[PDB]
Amino acid sequence: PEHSQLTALGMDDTETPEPHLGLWYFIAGAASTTEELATFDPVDNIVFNMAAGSAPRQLQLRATIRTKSGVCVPRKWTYRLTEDLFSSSCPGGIMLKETGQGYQRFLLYNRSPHPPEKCVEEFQSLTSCLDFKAFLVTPRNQEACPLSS
Amino acid sequence: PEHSQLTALGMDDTETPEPHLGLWYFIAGAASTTEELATFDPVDNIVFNMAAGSAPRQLQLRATIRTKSGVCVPRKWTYRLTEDLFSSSCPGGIMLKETGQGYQRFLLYNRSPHPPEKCVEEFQSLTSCLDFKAFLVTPRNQEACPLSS
Ligand code: NA
Ligand code: NA
């Protein structure tokens, strides 16, 4: 089972509930090339929940993508899990690193659909610092899409 | 001419003189694997100057490495140049990214042989954040070595 790889890189540890409960939102991505972010160009917003993957060391995201054009695309994604920022800039936040052969991207989620702008700024600033200058912030102009139970 | 690649990633812009004049010191390195830093294990300190490389888009470092065992190894290195941190944490600092096929490392220099410890801490913290957890700080217990003119 070859899946894309997630590594938790840091989070706001004071947020509730634990990560496998409740909803998360997709805020922004940073990568070294535009290709590693292009998949998100049609996205307005993403609401999702994270679950343990039944098989070991696995994460499942159940998502509904709100599209810039206004429609909703439901999605169930399975990943392999790997074997400052959130202290003030990003309350309710989590940053993950997505990895497979030939690609890397950093992904910024939040418990809130509209976190304080200084979160995206600090994430941009930090990733830009280390030369991951391809950057994408979801516009989040539209309502979230329905997501099951 | 295939050389290792340097990209200036940020610097304290208030330091004098311009980078191609005066001396610099090697403070620390961060990479994703120990292999990308192993070359520096025998190092106590490095004093060097940076020069334009006569051929275009090229940088030359003339260095003398003080070795942990106490000796001095002179060095002339030629690189290809690419086509927050320093605002407070690292006065006199510069961070570079060294790159070639199959490897990346971030390199921290300073005008001063012993910058304030909160510089190394912020560089460690920032690189560690983005999952570049192989880390090396030169011990700098010994005197710098002589370097020409
Ligand atoms: Na920087
Ligand atoms: Na972090």
Curated annotation (Swiss-Prot), chains A, B:
Pfam families: ApoM. One of its GO terms (molecular function) is antioxidant activity. GO terms for biological process: cholesterol efflux; high-density lipoprotein particle assembly; high-density lipoprotein particle clearance; high-density lipoprotein particle remodeling; lipoprotein metabolic process; negative regulation of plasma lipoprotein oxidation; reverse cholesterol transport. Expressed by the liver; secreted in plasma. Keywords: Disulfide bond, HDL, Lipid transport, Secreted, Signal, Transport. It comes from the Eukaryota. SUPFAM superfamilies: Lipocalins. The keyword Ribosomal protein does not apply. It is found in: Secreted. Tetradecanoate binds at E98, R105. InterPro entries: ApoM (IPR022734), Calycin (IPR012674). Disulfide bonds join C72-C145, C90-C119. GO terms for cellular component: discoidal high-density lipoprotein particle; extracellular region; high-density lipoprotein particle; low-density lipoprotein particle; spherical high-density lipoprotein particle; very-low-density lipoprotein particle. Probably involved in lipid transport. Can bind sphingosine-1-phosphate, myristic acid, palmitic acid and stearic acid, retinol, all-trans-retinoic acid and 9-cis-retinoic acid. Interacts with LRP2; LRP2 mediates APOM renal uptake and subsequent lysosomal degradation. Belongs to the calycin superfamily. Lipocalin family. Highly divergent. This is Apolipoprotein M. It comes from Mus musculus (Mouse).
